Structure formats: C-alpha cells, structure tokens
Amino acid sequence: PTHLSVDTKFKTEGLCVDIPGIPKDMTYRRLISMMGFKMNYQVNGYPNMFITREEAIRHVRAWIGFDVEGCHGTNLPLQLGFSTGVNLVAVPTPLMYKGLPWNVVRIKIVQMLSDTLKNLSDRVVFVLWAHGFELTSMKYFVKIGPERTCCLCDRRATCFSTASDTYACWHHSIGFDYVYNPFMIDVQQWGFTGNLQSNHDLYCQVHGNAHVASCDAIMTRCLAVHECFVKRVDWTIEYPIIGDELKINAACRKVQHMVVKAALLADKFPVLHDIGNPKAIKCVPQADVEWKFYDAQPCSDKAYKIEELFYSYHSDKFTDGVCLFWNCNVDRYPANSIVCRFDTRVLSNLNLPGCDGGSLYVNKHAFHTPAFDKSAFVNLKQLPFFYYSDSPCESHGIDYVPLKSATCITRCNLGGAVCRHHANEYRLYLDAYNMMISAGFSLWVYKQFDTYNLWNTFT
C-alpha cells in the first residue's frame, strides 16, 4: 500500500515494436532485470525503480519527461530527449546537439538534471511513454544501489562518480557521470487508447511534435501533468518548503488587507462580493461593508466564464458594490473589481510548466493554473503601488534615513514629514509587495480607483 511492488504486472504492448517478441505477461521485477539492473533483494529504501501514480504526484517537482528515438540497438545512434528541451545524440562507437559517445553524454545528463532539479527536488522522476529504447538505454547513464547520502553534505544521493567512487546530491554533482537511484513511471500503463500525440493534442494545443525526442518528452510530462493535476485535483497533498513559500504567502495576505481596506475607504462601497476559495475569510474584518461570499474552487482546466459564475439566477446584483476575485481566475472580469491574478509565465522554483499554456504552481499545494490572458482585464487597470495607514504615529521599539515618498499615504506625510513607525511599515510593506509581484502575482482594480481619495480619511 505504500510503494509499487516489483511483482505488479507491466503491460508490454507499447514495447513490442522496439522489442519484438516481448512476453505479454511481465512484472516490474522481470522488466528491471531485462533493462540490465540486478536488484539482488535490497531492503535499503529503494524497493523499485518504478513508482505509483500517487508517489509520482507527491514528487511532481522531480518530473522530467524522457524519450529515446532511434536515429537508425548498439549499432544505431540514439536521440535522448528531455522535458528541459535538451536533445543529446549517443553513438556506440528544442536544443538539438550532435552525436557523441555515451561517456560524454552521461556527464551532460548529470549536469542537466542537477541544474534543473537542485532547487526543486531531492530526486529525479523520468516520466515515460515507453516504447523500448528509453528503458534499454538507462543502463548507460544510471547506476542503482542502496539509499545513500551526499559526500559533501547530508542530502540524499542522486549522482555517482566512477572517477572518485563517491556519491552526491544535485548541488554537489559537478563532474559526476552517473544518475544514481532514479525513479520512473510509464504513462502508457494508465490505460490510454491511441498514441502519445493523439492523447496530448486532446487537452493541449501549446506543444507541437517536431518528431524530435524532446518534443515527445515534453508532451509526455504535459499529458502526465494534465491527468494528475488538471482533471484530478488532490488538494490534500502537502509539499515540502523549497524556497520563499512563507514570505510569499505572508506578503499576499498583507497586500490583500491593504488593497481591499483602501478601496473600501476610497469608494465607500456598500457591499463586497467575494468570489473564490470556499474556505476564505474577510481580509478586512473591521470594514463597514456588507461582505458576501461565493464559493468557487481553483479552476485547473480553463478560466471560469463570468456568465456561468454570476448569471443563471447572494445580492444577485453583482454590479452593486465591488467584486473581489482573489486568485479566482475568470475569462473577463467585471469593471467593478479588485483582482489578484497569478501570471503563469513567471520564471520560479514554485512555478512548474503546465498543460495548454497553463502552469502548475506548487506552494504547499499544487494548483494547475490556466494560461495568463491579458484580455481578462479590459474593464480594469493595473493597481498602482501605495501604502496606506490610519494608525497613530508612534515609534515603539531598525535604523533610520528620512523617507520621502508620494505613495506613503499617512497623516504624518499629509502634515509634512513621515514618522519613523510608518516609515518602517512603509519599507516592510514595499518589500512584501515586491515579493508578491516577483512571485508572479498581478494586481488589477476598477478604473475609477484613485489614491488621492485616501488623504480625505485624515480629518
């Protein structure tokens, strides 16, 4: 019930063109042996090179699509393709590299995986659409053995070096030549009818097939991502903290209280329609406004049609007051809205590439977010930075260099000079806002929003 048993059956139909005459009855134990790996009954935390769908989902940050195409079987050169976009050519003697021997190819494989995964995961998961040559070629760049630790640190071992007989994690594997103890999963064992391209092209129109191994590796991991995260959503799975997850979420909550609290003071809306997370709370609990909630889970597939969220017959008058769409992804936002929308294009360790232009955002939980579409925001404008505070000016306590800013909306700045307390709070809030923007989130607001209306709240 925890791992994939080596005695589970492996459907070999998808392997009989590269491997003609392959037995119909086959288990993982025989398949691993067939690949050139003697497991020799080793109870050292590595029960099987292959894993379950649930284990692959728990370790999605490790997924690397892998495909091998025959450029002509120890006679023919192989094209090794990865979801990173790399194409290596191995000779037995998008990045498309020329034909080189296995000893140099295996060195580049360790470099590529270590640079790709060092800040993502403690392992690699080869996501396959197994036809034969990828499983047979693994003996040339993979060495297996008991679970281990890094020679330079305490992280688990993910690489091996024959030159120095030592093991290393993804950070200390410079010059290492073997992938040590990788994991893998064959998507073809999930019961797909038809080939990779047909199943991929059913959900994703963003990846095309140039017939190169990398294109297939991308389509494989994409289709695996769709199956596990787009159409199957398991928000119960927690994920390790691998970066600024805590500061990003703290920043978002701070920005959220700030933007909503200020909009309510500037335009004095009677009602706020909060559309999104069914578990969300009032971000501004002391606000005068009538707060109404609408439940809508994170749409993993496509953005919600505003016509299905509001219409079809709650105040029902969504045009009265302001709508708050905090991370609720809709096709076109109404003009009376405050919106936080995650930009799927952002380059970060928390954002993994998704399906159909979307992205898998892993921050405590995995959220496949649909593609960012700038046209969702035609009735709105980008929210400009500001810091508002109605709190008393009282230091209570962080050194000081006089703060002079137009965007620090406080009583002290109204009356001339900014005080030390609001000056610390301004720089802390500025850092949180910067944290939030860089983490790929974008803020938008109704066109009539003006920060000038906030000075009046000081009388």
Active site residues: 67, 69, 134, 211, 216
DSSP H helical ranges for 133-212: 133-136, 196-200
User: Should residue 156 be labelled a site residue for Zn ion when binding is judged by CB under 5 A?
Assistant: no
| φ and ψ of 212, to 5 deg | -85, 150
Q: Distance of CA 403 to CAs 195, 210, 229, 412, 418, Å?
A: 62, 56, 46, 11, 6
422 binds, among Zn ion, ligand SZE, none (CB under 5 to 8 A by kind): Zn ion
State the DSSP string of 53-70: HHHHHHTGGGEEEEEEEE
Instruction: Identify whether the C-beta of residue 328 lies closer than 8 Å to the C-beta of residue 296.
Output: yes
The position carrying tokens 């889970």 is 297
In whole angstroms, what is the distance from residue 65 CA to residue 241 CA? 23
**Cβ–Cβ < 8 Å for 369, 342:** yes
Is 67 annotated to bind ligand? yes
121 binds, among Zn ion, ligand SZE, none (CB under 5 to 8 A by kind): ligand SZE
In terms of phi and psi (left: phi > 0; alpha: psi -120 to 50; beta: otherwise), the region of 165 is left
In this chain, which stretch among 45-53, 142-150, 209-217, 308-316 interacts with Zn ion, using CB under 5 A? 142-150
Subset of residues 375 to 394 that bind Zn ion, contact rule: CB under 5 A: 393
Using CB under 5 A, pick the residue from 32, 128, 222, 262 that binds Zn ion.
222
Decide whether 122 or 244 has the Cβ nearer to ligand SZE: 122
Residue 427 lies near Zn ion (rule: CB under 5 A): no
Grouping H, G, I as helix, E, B as strand and the rest as coil, residue 309 is helix
207 is known to lie in a ligand binding site? yes
Could you say which of Zn ion, ligand SZE, none residue 130 binds, taking C-beta under 5 to 8 angstroms by partner kind?
Answer: none
Single residue of 159, 204, 213, 383 touching Zn ion by CB under 5 A: 204
Residue 278 carries which DSSP code?
Answer: T
- ∠243-116-205 over CA atoms, to 5°? 100
Assign 116 to helix, strand or coil: helix
- Closest approach, Cβ 58 to Zn ion, in A, equals 22
Do the strands 86-91 and 78-82 form a parallel or antiparallel pair, or are they unpaired?
A: antiparallel
Tell the smallest beta-carbon distance from residue 226 to ligand SZE (Å). Answer: 23
Stretch that binds Zn ion, among 128-136, 221-229, 312-320, 371-379 (CB under 5 A): 221-229
Positions that interact with ligand SZE (CB under 6 A):
119, 121-122, 155, 240, 242
410 contributes a contact to Zn ion by CB under 5 A: yes
Q: Which of 64, 169, 255, 264 binds Zn ion (CB under 5 A)?
A: 169
CA 215 to the chain's CA centroid: 20
Shortest separation between residue 8's beta carbon and Zn ion, angstroms: 28
**Structure letter (DSSP) for residue 188:** G
Judged by CB, which is closer to ligand SZE: 136, or 158? 158
| 150 makes contact with Zn ion (CB under 5 A) | yes
172 marked among binding-site residues: yes
Asked whether residue 36 is marked as a ligand-binding residue, the answer is no
Question: Whose Cβ is closer to ligand SZE: residue 13's or residue 238's?
Answer: 238
List residues near Zn ion by CB under 5 A.
Answer: 150, 152-153, 155, 169, 172, 204, 207, 222, 393, 410, 412, 419, 422
